[model samples]
Each structure stands twice: as structure tokens, then as C-alpha cells.
Target: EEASSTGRNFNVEKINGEWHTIILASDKREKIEDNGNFRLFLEQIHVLEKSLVLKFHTVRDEECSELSMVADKTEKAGEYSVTYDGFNTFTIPKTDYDNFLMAHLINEKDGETFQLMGLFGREPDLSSDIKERFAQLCEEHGILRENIIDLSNANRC
Candidate 1:
């Protein structure tokens, strides 16, 4: 699905039971290269599990983020535990995940505003009707909009 809010676009997908997001912009490549702010935040729907992982390099960014997701949930929520390669993992309970994502996204927003230009999700070989329904829910609830840069932009004083 595609959504427009605050001036940018977002693309979302469900792969392996987890939701993945991609924010689109004219300056996407530059942002990823310079900002040190571009990152992926995954929200697991099965149990409302969420994780925020940062990547320093452009090429390994996505892979690094994916690899970190393999850690056991039994790990500490506030401290980093080792995962793929030598990267660490940190677990945040469902309750805290929302706030954590909000904080990071908001911080990254700085003083500018952008919209979610696109939002989509993928489901394995099965009827996509359910996936479509869930995407609609995400739109109505502002999950994509709320997490995007709009809120921060509106709240700017």
C-alpha cells in the first residue's frame, strides 16, 4: 500500500511474519549516506514484538538489521546481547516498543517534515485479502503516519 503524510512516502511489507518498512524520498541515497539517521524498525505482529536496529554502513545496513533479529527474547531489554556476526541485540517488550520507536523516529525528524509516500507488506503464498485488510488497519490507525515525520513536524514550535 502507499500512503502520503507530511510530504514523504513509506513502503511496508511482511516477510517471515515480521513487518518491514522503507521510507522513500528524493534524497534517500544521500540521507542514508550522510544522516547516520536512516534505520529500520521492525514490528512483529504475531506477538506485537518490535525491534529497532541501526546500521552504520550503507550496503550492510539491511543485512545487519535482519541478522540482529535472531536473538532470543529472553535477553535483556535495556542491554545489548550478541547476535549475528558480532553485532548485539536488545529486546524491548511490546509495551515499550511503541514509545521506543516514537522517540527514535521523532529524534531523526530533526526540524523537517516528510510524508509516507508508500506503504506495502508481503505475505507468503496465501490469499492476500487478510494482508490487505491489515494494511488498511495500519492506515486508519496512523501506524505509518504516526511513526513517520509528520507528528514531529506538526509539533514543531
Candidate 2:
């Protein structure tokens, strides 16, 4: 049971040793300003290592174009579902962990410059930004990522 007026919710859930990235957007807003944490909201989940299979559980109806958009961006075997109870679940490939899917969400404008700042740091790689959102989610609900993730890099200049 989630709270009221949460904007949207995303989580990395597991069952039977399988992990899932679930997005709960039943009360989603129409624009960016309407929801301040839009990008950070999207940047909520992180997959593990060991070539694990990441899956998705979002609103299945085609009317939710954002979900569909994310689904389309999510990679497959070369590639990339069903419904359980009141939600639809599907696989999100290992390739999409950083770039492809996460990168787009990282780029989403969230009323700030650092919303896109992520694990990879401000490098030539993907989701490149400062360190903010990661600490945010971690404090928000312990959004722990299992991939030896780093934000405040000890790397070069």
C-alpha cells in the first residue's frame, strides 16, 4: 500500500531469485513541472551484475505512451511479457542497464541540472553527471544497486 500523490514509483523487486524493475505510474502527471522528481523518478532502479536478466512491470495499456516508449527503448536478445494480478511484467535486458534505457531517463529534465547525474560520473560514458540522484534514492527508500556502482569517482581530470 503506497501513499497518496506520490507522482510515480519505481522499484527493483525480486522473487524466486529473479529480479524485476517495476514502475507504478497510476497517478502520473502530464508535464515536467507537474512532477518535480520526473527524471529522478525514472532513474529509480539499478540492475545487478553476473549477466542477470532485468524485467519490467509497468502499466500495460498502449495509452500510456511513456511506458511503451521505455519498453521500445529496452533491448532484447539480439533483442526483449505478461500480467500478474493487476500489473504487466516483462524482461529488461542486461545491455540496457546503463545506456539505451537508463541514459534516456537520465537525460530527462527534472527541474535541475544534476538530476541526470549518475553512477558513471561526469565522464565520456553514459548517464554522465554529478552526484545527487543516487544519494537521493538511497535516502528515499534504500534504492541499492548491486553493480559496484560509483558516482563520486576517484578517477582522473
Candidate 3:
């Protein structure tokens, strides 16, 4: 089953500011693995009238590399469209506004489709219940437990 938004009124402003990547998973192993194209560690989130801005850093050549992107808002409240690895549809299927956020990404590149999910937190640590919920969400999206990588201790740039 594909996870959908909770459909409650989302307060987007509260989600802005620094965020830590808690866990990341993908159907393709390499995409979220070491130095993979999708291996970005989230830093900050900013919202604009028609788009969302993201700041992220990733490990590359033993150093931190940063990248920023703009994901334009869609008609839906928690969905955005951005071009990165390829044409991508990014959706926030779940979030607590202050504690945690869960994002689902669908990427189409070179005629191949990839599905990935990430869990982010306002702080570096999250409750065990939230981790369990993230695992369940991955399961619903067909991403098994083994594919999920915990980044709680990963270096932040």
C-alpha cells in the first residue's frame, strides 16, 4: 500500500529551520548508500509562496558537499515537484510539524523508476515510536527493513 497524507491542515511554517536526516531507504540499494546520488543529508527547509527550498549536504571524497534545490508546490498541500536525479515527485506523507517528517520520493531517470523514503527530525534524536512508524511506512511502500539506513549518528555539515 502506498502511504498518503494524513489530510489534516498542515502548518508549513512550523517545519522550517534545521532538520536532521534520521533514516533513509530506497528500493535500489545504491541510491541511499555511501556517496550515492540520493544520499543527501538534510540540513534546512524553507517555504515560499509557491515553492519549498531545501538545503542538504552529503559525504563526498571524505568531505561534506552541499546542495540546495527548489521544489515547487503542487496543487496538493504537501507535494512538490523538483528536478534532481531526474523528474521527481516529492511528497510529505506524514509529519508532526515540530517533531518529525516523512517524505516519499519517486524518481524517473534514464527510463528507470526509483522509489525512496526519508525520515527527518527537528533534532538529531527521535523517539522509538517514531522510528517504528517510519519502518511501517517503508513497509507500506514496499521498502523492506534491511534497506533502511539510520543516519542519526551520521556527521552533519
Candidate 4:
């Protein structure tokens, strides 16, 4: 999908293997503000996905904080639920898990910046992959290393 506003164009295309590409440009403004604009974009994409399982479960909740304003500002709040069997799960070998954790930590710092900006009603100045942003946030919030393992262990016990 592509949209144009005030001479700026935004394009979002889903690649072949569950990958998506998003590009935004605004001639009126060089960048988008963190608080509402970026969040609005995230929320629009979430709505396009239209799956409760995919939205809440597959997509990390921390990333969804950017879209909180959508729920607060719209009539479509609390319209979704997460089901136990709504999605598939996989396990990574211990070694692979460690590597994944390390990588995730590095990426979560960016995510934290985006989240913090949105939380404060500001737009993130950084422009990068959403996954990178997510990973960055996880690291900053100690979600990647600490929360992931903690939650996993808690669920087991």
C-alpha cells in the first residue's frame, strides 16, 4: 500500500516470506514526530494485520506500546484477545538461544528509544528497522536477557 500526504509518500509492501517493508517521506516535514505520527503508522500496520494472535502474540507487546494511542483515541480498543493455540511455538537449542539472546540484546536498545519516545508523546528521531527497534527496547528494559528467561521459567513452573 502507498499513501501520499502533503507531497510526502509512504509505502508498505509485504515481501514474500512474512517480511514487510515500510517507507515514509514527507516534503512538508523532514521527519515524523515520535509521539503520535510514528505510533499512528505502527497502529495502521497492526490494523492491516487484523489477527489477534498475530498482533499480540507474534508481535511483542513492548513494540505495541507505540500504538497505545490508537486504542485510547479510537473506538476499536480492547477488541482483541490472545488464545493459547492461536499461534505456533518453537524451541531453540541452548547454544542457539544464547546467541539469539545476545543479538536480541543489541537490537533492543533501539526499540527502547522508540518506546520511550512514544510513551512521552514524541516521535523517534532514529530511522531503522522495526525489528532493530524492538530488539533495542528489549535490551534497554532488560526484556531480552532477563524477562525472556524469567517468563519462560515462570511459565514452566
Candidate that scores best on TM-score: 3
Screening candidate 3 with a backbone cut-off below 3 angstroms (N, C-alpha, C), the clashing residue pairs are: none
Q: How much lDDT does each candidate structure score?
A: 0.28, 0.25, 0.86, 0.21
Q: Give the higher-lDDT candidate: 2 or 4.
A: 2
* Model 4 misplaced stretches (Cα beyond 4 Å): 1-79, 85-131, 145-157
Which residue pairs come into collision in candidate 2? Answer: 54-92, 76-79, 76-80
- At residue 53, candidate 1 shows an lDDT of 36
- List TM-scores for all candidates, in order: 0.25, 0.18, 0.92, 0.20
lDDT of 2 by residue, 65-105 (tens): 13212222123221111122212223321222222222212
State which candidate has the highest lDDT: 3
Give the TM-score (vs. native) of candidate 1: 0.25
lDDT of 2 at 90: 34
Q: What does candidate 1's lDDT look like per residue over 93-129, in tens digits? A: 1111211111111112434532222222221111335
Q: Which window of 10 residues has the lowest lDDT sum in candidate 3?
A: 1-10
Sorted by TM-score (best first), the order is 3, 1, 4, 2
lDDT of 4 at 8: 29
Q: Residues 1-157, candidate 4: write the lDDT tens digits.
A: 2121111232111210111112221211212223223212321223344332121111233353321211111133212222121221111111111111111101022222211111110122223343344345445544432222111111110
Off by over 4 Å in 1: 1-17, 20-29, 32-36, 39-43, 46-63, 66-108, 124-157
With candidate 1 superimposed using the best TM-score fit, by how many Å does residue 86's alpha carbon deviate from the native?
27
lDDT of 3 by residue, 1-157 (tens): 2233435666677678988899999999799998798988898999877788999988987799888999988777678889998999888888877788999999999999989999999998789899999999999999999999998888575
Report how far residue 40 has shifted in candidate 1, in Å: 3.4
